[PDB]
Amino acid sequence: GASSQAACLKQILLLQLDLIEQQQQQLQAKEKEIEEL
Amino acid sequence: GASSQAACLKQILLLQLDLIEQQQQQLQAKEKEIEELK
Amino acid sequence: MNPVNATALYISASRLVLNYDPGDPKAFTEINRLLPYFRQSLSCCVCGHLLQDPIAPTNSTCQHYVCKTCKGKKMMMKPSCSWCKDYEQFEENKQLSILVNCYKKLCEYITQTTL
């Protein structure tokens, strides 16, 4: 069955969110460096 | 059923990939500034 | 200027949804409380509707967004935003459109976990 598939996709999705988040953070650090100069 | 759930989740994933790609593009645009100035 | 508020809210909502044990009351109400704000951040300031073609001001960090069919038209939040005023600050912010789609699909999934 495609039961576990759903669970996997959820986990991937959550991780991807984690990424998107860290990426936003890093965009902040970059905009900070640029604004600093 | 849970197959429509699954497909929905897939669509979301794909969108999230697009988003990630976009962020990556912007980040690269930012680092371009950083190496230029520093 | 990327849609910071909207992405943040998206992360919140998405998380609550994907960590919700369908049936459980607390997570559910938390979702229901949080969701409109995430919806709000993706609403056109002239329509009230969900951005049908997102245009963001290259102008400012003020984060007010409109449909493409909502150029030069009267915005709703009174007092009006100072930074918004200049209208030729048209940019098709992709991140926005994506987030709009994301929200739609999220609601779809939610209604599924509800029924």
Add this chain to the structure above:
Amino acid sequence: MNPVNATALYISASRLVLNYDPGDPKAFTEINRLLPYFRQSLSCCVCGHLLQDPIAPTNSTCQHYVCKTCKEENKQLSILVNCYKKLCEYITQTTLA
């Protein structure tokens, strides 16, 4: 330091696996083509196997990454490692041809 390689490869790989066109013959083979390059970009340059714990140096575009043990952490990379793991889990789980 921002990991361009790992992210780009993760994106394309995922895109392929998930946007699998079951009426395309090149469908499987392209996944298989990309997969090792992706796996590699996330492997330690002293360990050999996939990054155990990610450490990258400040603002070096040489893009080489190594385990915490093998001698500044990059959280993005750690996430990406997990992304590979989970993606592989999905791959093994589903049929692709």
